[PDB]
Design an enzyme around this catalytic site. Structure first.
Site, PDB file in Angstrom:
ATOM      1  N   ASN A  91      54.895 -26.493  46.989  1.00 14.87           N
ATOM      2  CA  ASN A  91      55.018 -26.808  45.540  1.00 14.87           C
ATOM      3  C   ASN A  91      56.423 -26.335  45.007  1.00 14.87           C
ATOM      4  O   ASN A  91      56.534 -26.231  44.318  1.00 14.87           O
ATOM      5  CB  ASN A  91      53.823 -25.811  45.824  1.00 14.87           C
ATOM      6  CG  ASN A  91      54.111 -24.018  45.299  1.00 14.87           C
ATOM      7  OD1 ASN A  91      55.324 -23.512  46.571  1.00 14.87           O
ATOM      8  ND2 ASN A  91      54.475 -22.623  44.443  1.00 14.87           N
TER       9      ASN A  91
ATOM     10  N   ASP B 104      56.755 -24.650  51.603  1.00 15.39           N
ATOM     11  CA  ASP B 104      58.121 -25.170  51.740  1.00 15.39           C
ATOM     12  C   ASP B 104      59.190 -23.521  51.412  1.00 15.39           C
ATOM     13  O   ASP B 104      60.241 -23.741  52.112  1.00 15.39           O
ATOM     14  CB  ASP B 104      58.255 -26.096  50.215  1.00 15.39           C
ATOM     15  CG  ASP B 104      57.930 -25.305  48.767  1.00 15.39           C
ATOM     16  OD1 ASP B 104      56.614 -24.414  48.973  1.00 15.39           O
ATOM     17  OD2 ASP B 104      58.679 -24.693  48.442  1.00 15.39           O
TER      18      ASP B 104
ATOM     19  N   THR C 225      58.337 -24.552  45.854  1.00 15.63           N
ATOM     20  CA  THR C 225      58.592 -22.321  44.442  1.00 15.63           C
ATOM     21  C   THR C 225      58.004 -21.466  45.734  1.00 15.63           C
ATOM     22  O   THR C 225      57.372 -21.573  46.963  1.00 15.63           O
ATOM     23  CB  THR C 225      57.441 -22.702  43.504  1.00 15.63           C
ATOM     24  OG1 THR C 225      57.783 -23.160  42.682  1.00 15.63           O
ATOM     25  CG2 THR C 225      57.818 -20.904  42.711  1.00 15.63           C
TER      26      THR C 225
ATOM     27  N   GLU D 181      68.969 -17.873  66.411  1.00 12.17           N
ATOM     28  CA  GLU D 181      68.780 -16.720  67.979  1.00 12.17           C
ATOM     29  C   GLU D 181      67.125 -16.238  66.794  1.00 12.17           C
ATOM     30  O   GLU D 181      66.179 -15.553  67.614  1.00 12.17           O
ATOM     31  CB  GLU D 181      69.428 -15.625  67.751  1.00 12.17           C
ATOM     32  CG  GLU D 181      71.267 -16.233  68.112  1.00 12.17           C
ATOM     33  CD  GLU D 181      72.027 -16.580  67.689  1.00 12.17           C
ATOM     34  OE1 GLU D 181      71.404 -17.129  66.268  1.00 12.17           O
ATOM     35  OE2 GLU D 181      72.607 -17.717  68.232  1.00 12.17           O
TER      36      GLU D 181
ATOM     37  N   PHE E  58      59.409 -14.859  56.925  1.00 13.29           N
ATOM     38  CA  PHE E  58      59.484 -16.427  56.284  1.00 13.29           C
ATOM     39  C   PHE E  58      60.257 -16.810  57.290  1.00 13.29           C
ATOM     40  O   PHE E  58      61.081 -16.659  58.302  1.00 13.29           O
ATOM     41  CB  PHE E  58      59.151 -16.586  55.408  1.00 13.29           C
ATOM     42  CG  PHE E  58      60.664 -16.374  54.226  1.00 13.29           C
ATOM     43  CD1 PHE E  58      62.047 -16.331  54.818  1.00 13.29           C
ATOM     44  CD2 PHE E  58      60.600 -17.234  53.083  1.00 13.29           C
ATOM     45  CE1 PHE E  58      63.340 -16.338  54.772  1.00 13.29           C
ATOM     46  CE2 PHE E  58      63.034 -17.505  52.546  1.00 13.29           C
ATOM     47  CZ  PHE E  58      63.631 -16.415  53.635  1.00 13.29           C
TER      48      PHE E  58
ATOM     49  N   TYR F 175      49.119 -22.913  43.247  1.00 13.17           N
ATOM     50  CA  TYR F 175      48.234 -22.527  42.928  1.00 13.17           C
ATOM     51  C   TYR F 175      47.485 -21.644  41.816  1.00 13.17           C
ATOM     52  O   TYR F 175      46.217 -21.525  41.686  1.00 13.17           O
ATOM     53  CB  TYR F 175      48.339 -20.945  43.854  1.00 13.17           C
ATOM     54  CG  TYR F 175      49.393 -21.619  44.844  1.00 13.17           C
ATOM     55  CD1 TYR F 175      48.451 -21.092  45.859  1.00 13.17           C
ATOM     56  CD2 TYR F 175      50.856 -21.436  45.514  1.00 13.17           C
ATOM     57  CE1 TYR F 175      49.185 -21.404  47.641  1.00 13.17           C
ATOM     58  CE2 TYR F 175      51.528 -21.938  46.301  1.00 13.17           C
ATOM     59  CZ  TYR F 175      50.139 -21.398  47.561  1.00 13.17           C
ATOM     60  OH  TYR F 175      50.762 -21.973  49.011  1.00 13.17           O
TER      61      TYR F 175
END
Ligand SMILES: CC1=NC(=N)C(C[n+]2c(/C(O)=C/COP(=O)([O-])O)sc(CCOP(=O)([O-])OP(=O)([O-])O)c2C)C=N1
Ligand SMILES: C/C(NCc1cnc(C)nc1N)=C(/S)CCOP(=O)([O-])OP(=O)([O-])O
Ligand SMILES: C/C(NCc1cnc(C)nc1N)=C(/S)CCOP(=O)([O-])OP(=O)([O-])O
Ligand SMILES: [K+]
Ligand SMILES: [K+]
Ligand SMILES: [K+]
Ligand SMILES: [K+]
Ligand SMILES: [Mg+2]
Ligand SMILES: [Mg+2]
Ligand SMILES: [Mg+2]
Lengths: 552, 562, 551
Positions: B480, B453, B482, B47, B428, B551
């Protein structure tokens, strides 16, 4: 110096919490999760998984458990797990970060929502931290409310600045005793013993009584006491979805679980066979949220009902018991044993025609061209579960869908919570987190999950969590490229389907599982399925089996 | 006979709605979704995806859109999409089933929650249907509230029995006119013209003024008017995340977007360069939710500020502008054109050291041992987008994470909403549904998505929806293993990481996409990435590209986040 | 060192506030009410009186006003005044104390209620102070929300520890500018000018249009503009209960206010006479909460409607205007003037038989045996008000009851807010605090109050406040020992009465007034009433007149 983050984790540890499930956001600047020895963070791919895993772990352990999300959408994602806990009943402490205290402007500050207002309607207790040192009493009050029937989640909102503050925190002064309730605190009415005596008088006169047992009886620690009562008086035991396994598989008084779908699934008068000759129904630990509704037992002859619950009746519109006993279930059973000590065994009514029909489904030898049938899948799961598990052990978990009601009718449960599903909330995607919670609660026991493609794929990403934690869960995905139950509902209400609302394209769940680092295989008949289950069960790692199915 | 389900879909259609995004539950017994011609159901795997797709479609079209969930957990899952709409400002009509009216006992009836009480704090309007025929006026009131600034979601809870009822419904009498607002209704304060006159006086006196433009200016239809004003007076234009593209790529007054992370990412005094010599800041269509905060422009010399917004200032604790102009953004610019007609063009300040630093990052020719760097990834995306898109067309969508701020600094945006991300809510998993909304809003334009990811996998199951809808979205997953941004925060707060709270195991996203029926490949350098992107852009089918990244952050460089 | 108490009062003063009405509890240990020069506390006997007085002062001045209550039951008592403000539309800042911040446990701590949760549903804005120095921004946000249409109350809950705290407070650094809106902020829809043009087109085609004027038109400052438009095009002006006085008494286009009982009160088809031939209704500043509902004008022939309001239509279930113009009322009228500049004046439909009936009704010379009739009472009040007040001045206040219909239909109003009552909330007991507010707003003008025995006695203890402040209000109590309107409702619904639910014993309101230090007399006919009113109007002190009435 130790902050509110340390004081929070330490108080959770005091209440016996050893794991916090969640997803951490920018509040990681305030809380690392290594502050306190004995409590470990369990990172999930989505917050729903975290909330449900905590729910199931709390259900099986009987102890408060904890979950974690960030501010805003973290908290809203977690709220489906909170909803699971409030409706399915489990003592969960749900924790979410919030905007810095001086910057709390809901719907104006970045990621700032009114968390307490949003969560208050679906929780036992909801509060926002204001003075850092008070987090200890907020945890205590949260636990107090969570562990009062009906058990459910308590929420604490944690502004990031206060979470990282040591103001007023003095860790040289030891915490006061936690005094965590051993089992849920119950509501008790004056004169419940007299009501229990009235129930005993009804039983005295009754020809064919039954015990209808709900999960609250398990929480009360009443399973052994209920079993001893039923055995002495020869009273059949019927259960909700969630109380399967209160009697072992094969027990003569194990009359099975009820689902409203059972007549239709079996093409059989199942509810009539179960209830028609019954004259007294004792709903032991009754909860409407488990979804065994009065209309389901109201078959055949007129019946008297006895309600036993550690809550006041919330639904007199729906259920008006002839006798309402408001007390702790175990307390009731112990009083009832004294009252009925002089009583002898009843003659129980005959349900062999129903047992024959159920056994016929499970044995179904046909090899179908268009995929397996769900009853065949569950039969196969039962066989290998019995092989893999010690007696009285193992868990079969079911996600949500048409297949779930086959699980209710057909799945093996040799112990309390030996079959797990979501009865009150029934969020699809429930399977994975429930299997996670179940496997962690029972580290040395086999854990099988059954899920449909619709529900499974809604929450399939946490396959990686299963791989990462190396939880040796065996998953069966029954696939028909459809939200199947929903297509059934379309036909019930309209006498036709509408595909845009229910139909999916193909997902290769074997390839999906392997992408997540979980070994998998496809099984298309009983032989391939048994082979796959037996492999999975001995693998020492998670395993996934995709099975094409059809509903007829 | 037609039921409330028919009346609901029919009223949505009256308001221009052609799609309803969502997941249907047992209310399917009361609603099929074929009742009304011209309105189609769009089924998602979750949803959240449905709510965000409606949000983004609503943003780009400027028209109310609609999403759908079942009772209980359907509604709570949808609520993250509703939170997206309320913080990001989009006119979404969110609809959810409820238990049969006579059986509504929240937290006792199976799947029954107090939906209105849960949603009310995160919406413009929230109501439960009680009398079937009134669904027409409930939709009207929902749209009314949704299309008043600040725009946001309106929620209607639909007990299954009432939804499938024909009681009081008469489809032989035509519906009254819908009269959907063509642009949001706004708050206007008496004397705003005089406030705008005071702002003009400040502009006359300023040596180095800037326009800081937010998304509300775009909603007002004020982009052409703002561009003409800035060009005439030589005033630089700086934007929030989603107002990128109010001036074309390469325009001399395009001074870029602000993110609090820019100094740390660039290892450069970027905010100081951008703002130090500025003496006047005009926040045109200001919204605190977009997360360009006063503390970010408060660099160097003291500034005067003018706030222009179609809302009363909700945050005087944080932002006390010298001049507050509460009015429609376009109305203001048109008045402001008259007030400043005889002004001589300004002398704009220098930001070339910042521009040079950004250009240097985009051109980074190094080959790293441990994956690509995100600025190299965005540079490659920019190149192929420029190739694939017509001038002034194309969308780059970004999910949430550390890489998103690289997107803000580096991503191409050659039109308003040419770079899409979630500035207010920042959930996210945003990427997929936003790309779905964007591609549907712009069917003939290229749509690229970048996601990390962590966020991507939170909501990756809707890859199947992209495949099913055959939306030719090109996705780049920067991996990565993470929750990278969160590891940065750990280091900022504690001077060390804690892996149990941020670290994942391996996920093969190429394999994941293929399991969902989406062709995919892995790219490990610029050469491989450009080739993958060009393949995806010409494919006529969705395509996914996984890129390993790292990073290596400098936690000391992020003081601007305080 | 100055505290949040000082900072609160200072910020109210910045917004033009000079009075705080209320009742103070144990928060007196944290706030004295002498911290700031120019702002005075007005002590009432009940918090309802404090809230309503602030509501009415805010209405007449057009400026935010303030009221005060203690924690728990102080706040719940104030909430009826807050409710008055939200429904009746006035910018009120409502302030209430709360338990010490660290001791806030609603329904467990002594006197501790969840004030924000209780007040939020009936306010524009509601918040609890958490950090002392932030009181300044909380006051500003309260004013912002109060002064946006529909104007209403904003509430701040004040934990007593935080109220008496100087933490983070520095009065050496001057307050930022207050920027109090001079008239309410409103919403404006894109294309409203085009909507006004469509309204103009309807007007061009209309034979008998009317303007139905609500109080939002007054707040917008549109009264002179509306009058000029109406006079030029010869358009009748009908008002809500609250907008009586937008035209002077005697003006040819002043068709008055209407109620549902008008036909029954006059024994005349009054509403059909007013509305039947009308073909276009322009509801200027429309608000459902003023209780002039569409059903009122929907008499006779079918009508076109134009809604003008600084708000989006909250009630499409009930009112679906043919043209909806969402904008500032003054901005609308100014635009409408341009669009209609060349239009010829209209013919008005004859309402003379109605005017003749009303005049005859009010002049009713009969001397009744069982008390006066209310029309005679209002007629007498109108006479002495005309005598006592300068042209365009004076206020008549009505409390709530059957008698209030007579005030609405017949009472003199020679200026905006010349007649006051509660149209939205309609709490009985409203009369006294409204008259306090009216007299404080207009200190050199006569202020008359009419109230029934039921509503008057529900809040009669604030007579002492009228005495204490020496506000020369003249009160008429129409007494029939009954909640009369409620007995009428019994008869409509059940075709009979039930006395236990409506009837009182005798209250001597003359002796009641004198016990509070207010001189009083009983008047039993026009002659005795006119004399009592004239004496009161010239007394230079409050006066109360009891009048036996019958329905
Ligand atoms: C706080 C409170 N306020 C109230 N108004 C009431 C009920 N109530 C009244 C009321 O509002 C009736 C409805 O009127 P409406 O149809 O115009 O909306 S009118 C009244 C005493 C009328 O009696 P009176 O003052 O002696 O006057 P009269 O006898 O009716 O002329 C009472 C009790 C209850 N509590
Ligand atoms: C969509 C839905 N239910 C409504 C729904 C929607 N969204 C949520 C969060 N929860 C629920 N219960 C079901 S039961 C899907 C079942 O499909 P499946 O998992 O493939 O199983 P089956 O096809 O056997 O019904
Ligand atoms: C967990 C989290 N944020 C907190 C969070 C949690 N849960 C939700 C629903 N939303 C947010 N924003 C982020 S930013 C993860 C980012 O990881 P990534 O997508 O791999 O990106 P990167 O590694 O570049 O930071
Ligand atoms: K075994
Ligand atoms: K091109
Ligand atoms: K998900
Ligand atoms: K006079
Ligand atoms: Mg399926
Ligand atoms: Mg990452
Ligand atoms: Mg009376």
């Amino acid at each position: 110096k130790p902050t509110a983050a340390h004081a929070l984790l330490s108080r959770l540890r005091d209440h016996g919490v050893g794991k916090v499930f969640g997803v951490v956001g920018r509040e990681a600047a305030s809380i690392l999760f290594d502050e306190v020895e004995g409590i470990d963070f369990v990172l999930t791919r989505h917050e729903f998984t975290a909330g449900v895993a905590a729910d199931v772990l709390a259900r099986i352990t009987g102890r408060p458990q904890a979950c974690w999300a960030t501010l805003g959408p973290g908290m809203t994602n977690l709220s489906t797990g909170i909803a699971t806990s409030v409706l399915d009943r489990s003592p969960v402490i749900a924790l979410a970060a919030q905007s810095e205290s001086h910057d709390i402007f809901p719907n104006d500050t970045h990621q700032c929502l009114d968390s307490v207002a949003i969560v208050a309607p679906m929780s036992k207790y909801a509060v926002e931290l204001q003075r850092p040192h008070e987090i200890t009493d907020l945890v205590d009050s949260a636990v107090n409310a969570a562990m009062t029937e009906p058990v459910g989640p308590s929420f604490i909102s944690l502004p990031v600045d206060l979470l990282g503050s040591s103001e007023g925190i003095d860790t040289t002064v030891p915490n006061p005793p936690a005094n965590t309730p051993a089992k849920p605190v119950g509501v008790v009415a004056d004169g419940w013993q007299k009501a229990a005596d009235q129930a005993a008088a009804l039983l005295a006169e009754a020809k064919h009584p039954v015990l209808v047992v709900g999960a609250a009886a398990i929480r009360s620690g009443a399973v052994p006491a209920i079993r001893a009562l039923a055995e002495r008086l020869n009273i059949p035991v019927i259960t909700t979805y969630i109380a399967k396994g209160v009697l072992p598989v094969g027990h003569e008084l194990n009359y099975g679980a009820v689902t409203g779908y059972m007549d239709g699934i079996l093409n059989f008068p199942a509810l009539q066979t179960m209830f028609a000759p019954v004259d007294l129904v004792l709903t032991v630990g009754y909860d409407y949220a488990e979804d065994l509704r009065p209309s389901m037992w109201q078959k055949g002859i007129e019946k008297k009902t006895v309600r036993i619950s550690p809550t006041v009746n919330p639904i007199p519109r729906v259920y008006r018991p002839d006798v309402d006993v408001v007390t702790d279930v175990l307390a009731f059973v112990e009083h009832f044993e004294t009252a009925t000590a002089s009583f002898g065994a009843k003659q129980r009514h005959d349900i062999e025609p129903l047992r024959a029909r159920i056994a016929e489904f499970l044995a179904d030898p046909e090899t179908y061209e268009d995929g397996m049938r769900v009853h065949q899948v569950i039969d196969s799961m039962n066989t290998v579960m019995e092989e893999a598990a010690e007696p009285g052990e193992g868990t079969i978990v079911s996600d949500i869908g048409f297949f779930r009601h086959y699980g209710v009718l057909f799945a093996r449960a040799d112990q309390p919570f030996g079959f797990l599903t979501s009865a009150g909330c029934s969020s699809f995607g429930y399977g994975i987190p429930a299997a996670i919670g179940a496997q962690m609660a029972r580290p040395d026991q086999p854990t099988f999950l059954i899920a449909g493609d619709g529900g499974f794929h809604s929450n399939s990403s946490d396959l990686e969590t299963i791989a990462r934690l190396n939880l040796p869960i065996v998953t069966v995905v029954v696939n028909n490229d459809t939200n199947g139950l929903i297509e059934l509902y379309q036909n019930i209400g309209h006498h036709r389907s509408h595909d845009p609302a229910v139909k999916f394209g193909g997902v290769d769940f074997v390839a999906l599982a392997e992408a997540n680092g979980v070994d998998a295989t496809r099984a298309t008949n009983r032989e391939e399925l048994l082979a796959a289950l037996r492999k999975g069960a001995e693998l020492g790692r998670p395993f996934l089996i995709e099975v094409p199915v059809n509903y007829d």
